[PDB]
Amino acid sequence: SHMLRWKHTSSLKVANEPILAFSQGSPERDALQKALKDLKGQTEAIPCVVGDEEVWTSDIQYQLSPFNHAHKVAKFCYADKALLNRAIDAALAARKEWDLKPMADRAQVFLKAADMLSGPRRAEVLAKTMVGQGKTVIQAEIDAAAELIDFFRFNAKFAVELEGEQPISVPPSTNHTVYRGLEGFVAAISPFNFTAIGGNLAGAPALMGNVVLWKPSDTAMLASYAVYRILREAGLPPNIIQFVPADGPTFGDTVTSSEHLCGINFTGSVPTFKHLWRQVAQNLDRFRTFPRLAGECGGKNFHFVHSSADVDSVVSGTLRSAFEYGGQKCSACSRLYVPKSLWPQIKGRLLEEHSRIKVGDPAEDFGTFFSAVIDAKAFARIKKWLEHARSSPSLSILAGGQCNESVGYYVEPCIIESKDPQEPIMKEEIFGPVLTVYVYPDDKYRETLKLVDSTTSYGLTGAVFAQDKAIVQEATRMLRNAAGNFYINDKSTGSVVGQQPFGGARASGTNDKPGGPHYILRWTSPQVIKETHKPLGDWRYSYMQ
Amino acid sequence: KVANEPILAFSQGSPERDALQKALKDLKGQTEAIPCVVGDEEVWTSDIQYQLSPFNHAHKVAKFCYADKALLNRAIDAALAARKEWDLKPMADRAQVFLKAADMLSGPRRAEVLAKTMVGQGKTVIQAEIDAAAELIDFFRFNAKFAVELEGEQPISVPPSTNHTVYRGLEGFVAAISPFNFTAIGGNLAGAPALMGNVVLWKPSDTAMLASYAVYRILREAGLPPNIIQFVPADGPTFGDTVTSSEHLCGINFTGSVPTFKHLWRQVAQNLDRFRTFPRLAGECGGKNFHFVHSSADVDSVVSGTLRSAFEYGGQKCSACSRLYVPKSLWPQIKGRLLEEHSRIKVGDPAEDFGTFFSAVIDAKAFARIKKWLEHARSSPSLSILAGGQCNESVGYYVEPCIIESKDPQEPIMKEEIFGPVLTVYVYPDDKYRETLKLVDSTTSYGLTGAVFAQDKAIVQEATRMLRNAAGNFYINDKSTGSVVGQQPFGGARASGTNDKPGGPHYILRWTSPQVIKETHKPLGDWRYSYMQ
Ligand SMILES: O=C(O)CCCC(=O)O
Ligand SMILES: O=C(O)CCCC(=O)O
Q: Give DSSP secondary structure letters for A415-457.
A: EEEES-TT-GGGTS---SSEEEEEEE-GGGHHHHHHHHHHSSS
Residues A457 and A529 in one domain: no
d(CA A225, CA A44): 10
Q: How was this structure determined?
A: X-ray
Q: Residue A503: left (phi > 0), alpha (psi -120 to 50), or beta? A: left
Q: Does the C-beta of B139 come closer than 6 Å to ligand 2?
A: no
Residues B214 and B308 in one domain: no
Strands (E), A183-308: 185-189, 212-215, 241-243, 261-267, 292-296, 301-305
Q: Which helix (H) or strand (E) holds B63?
A: strand B56-65
List of residues 6+ apart from B352 with CB closer than 8 A: none
Contact assessment for residue A280 and residue A262, using Cβ atoms and an 8 Å cutoff: no
User: Does the beta carbon of B157 lie under 8 angstroms from any beta carbon of chain A?
Assistant: yes
Give the count of Cβ contacts less than 8 A between chain A and B. 273
Mind giving me the DSSP string for B290-316? Answer: EEEE-TTS-HHHHHHHHHHHHHGGGG-
List of residues 6+ apart from B220 with CB closer than 8 A: none
Q: How far is the CA of A16 from the centre of ligand 1 (A)?
A: 17
Q: Residue A41: left (phi > 0), alpha (psi -120 to 50), or beta? A: left
Handedness of CA B61, B62, B63, B64 (dihedral sign): negative
Does residue B318 have an active-site annotation? yes
Mind giving me the DSSP string for A98-115? Answer: HHHS-HHHHHHHHHHHHH
d(CA A514, CA A277): 20
Residues B321 and B343 in one domain: yes
Determine whether the interchain pair A170/B126 forms a contact, defined as Cβ–Cβ distance below 8 Å.
Answer: no
Reference A105, options A210, A207, A231, A252; nearest CA is: A207
Declared resolution, Å: 1.8
d(CA A506, CA A508): 5
| A272 appears as a binding residue in the annotation | yes
Contact assessment for residue A302 and residue A333, using Cβ atoms and an 8 Å cutoff: yes
d(CA A288, CA A262): 8
Contact assessment for residue B367 and residue B397, using Cβ atoms and an 8 Å cutoff: yes
Domain boundary among B484, B499, B517: B484
d(CA B457, CA B469): 20
Residues A80 and A183 in one domain: yes
For chain A, how long is the longest CA-to-CA vector? 92
How does A192-207 read in b/e, with b if 16+ C-beta sit within 10 Å? bbbbbbbbbbbbbbbb
Contacts of B307 in chain A (CB under 8 A): 539
Determine whether the interchain pair A530/B474 forms a contact, defined as Cβ–Cβ distance below 8 Å.
Answer: yes
User: Does the beta carbon of B304 lie under 8 angstroms from any beta carbon of chain A?
Assistant: yes
**Which amino acid is it at B349?**
D
Number of domains in chain B: 2
Q: Of B129, B135, B284, B312, which residue is the catalytic one?
A: B284
CATH number at residue A254: 3.40.605.10
Residues B194 and B53 in one domain: yes
**Which amino acid is it at A400?**
G
Residues A290 and A328 in one domain: no
CATH number at residue B315: 3.40.309.10
Of the residues B277, B301, B521, the best mutation for testing chain A's interface (the one with the most A CB atoms within 10 Å of its CB) is B277
| A14 appears as a binding residue in the annotation | no
Interaxial angle between packed helices A248-256 and A270-282, expressed in degrees from 0 to 180 and rounded to the nearest 10? 30
User: Does the beta carbon of A166 lie under 8 angstroms from any beta carbon of chain B?
Assistant: no
* SS3 of residue A50 by DSSP: strand
User: How far, CA to CA in Å, does B459 sit from each of A4, B292, B294, B429, B440?
Assistant: 11, 12, 8, 16, 15
Residues B349 and B255 in one domain: no
Determine whether the interchain pair B278/A295 forms a contact, defined as Cβ–Cβ distance below 8 Å.
Answer: yes
d(CA B439, CA B410): 9
Cα–Cα–Cα angle for A424, A426, A430, nearest 5°?
85
DSSP state of A370: B
Contact assessment for residue A76 and residue A193, using Cβ atoms and an 8 Å cutoff: no
Radius of gyration of chain B (CA): 25
Tell me the sheet residues that pair with B280. B251
Residues A527 and A416 in one domain: no
Of the residues B291, B515, B522, the best mutation for testing chain A's interface (the one with the most A CB atoms within 10 Å of its CB) is B515
Q: Are strands B402-406 and B383-387 parallel, antiparallel or unpaired?
A: antiparallel
Q: Are strands B391-392 and B398-399 parallel, antiparallel or unpaired?
A: antiparallel
| A271 appears as a binding residue in the annotation | yes
Residues B58 and B176 in one domain: yes
User: Does the beta carbon of B477 lie under 8 angstroms from any beta carbon of chain A?
Assistant: yes
Q: Which residues sit directly before a break in chain A (C to N > 2.5 Å)?
A: none
d(CA B33, CA B31): 7
d(CA A339, CA A267): 35
Residues A52 and A174 in one domain: yes
| Three-class DSSP labels, A122-160 | HHHHHHHHHHHHCCCHHHHHHHHHHHHHHHHHHHHHHHH
Q: How far is A278 from chain B (nearest CA, A)?
A: 5
Mind giving me the DSSP string for B197-265? Answer: T-EEEEE--GGGHHHHHHHHHHHHHTTPPTTSEEE----HHHHHHHHHT-TTEEEEEEES-HHHHHHHH
Tell me phi and psi for residue A186, to 5 degrees.
-110, 140
Mind giving me the DSSP string for B144-163? Answer: HHHHHHHTT------TTEEE
**Which amino acid is it at B260?**
T
Ligand nearest to the CA of A515: 1
Q: How far is the CA of A401 from the centre of ligand 2 (A)?
A: 63
Strands (E), A453-510: 458-459, 461-465, 485-488, 505-506
* SS3 of residue A382 by DSSP: helix
Domain that holds residue B125: 1-285+485-533
Peptide bond into B155 cis (omega under 30): no
* SS3 of residue A181 by DSSP: strand
Residues B224 and B258 in one domain: yes
How does B70-93 read in b/e, with b if 16+ C-beta sit within 10 Å? ebbebbbebbbebbbebbeeebee
Contacts of A466 in chain B (CB under 8 A): none
User: Does the beta carbon of B21 lie under 8 angstroms from any beta carbon of chain A?
Assistant: no
User: Does the beta carbon of B16 lie under 8 angstroms from any beta carbon of chain A?
Assistant: no
* SS3 of residue A261 by DSSP: strand
List of residues 6+ apart from A105 with CB closer than 8 A: none
Cα–Cα–Cα angle for B432, B436, B440, nearest 5°?
170
* Closest ligand 2 atom to Cα of B255: 3
d(CA B485, CA B489): 6
Q: How far is A239 from chain B (nearest CA, A)?
A: 20
Handedness of CA A380, A385, A389, A393 (dihedral sign): positive
Residues A387 and A280 in one domain: no
Cα–Cα–Cα angle for B129, B132, B137, nearest 5°?
100
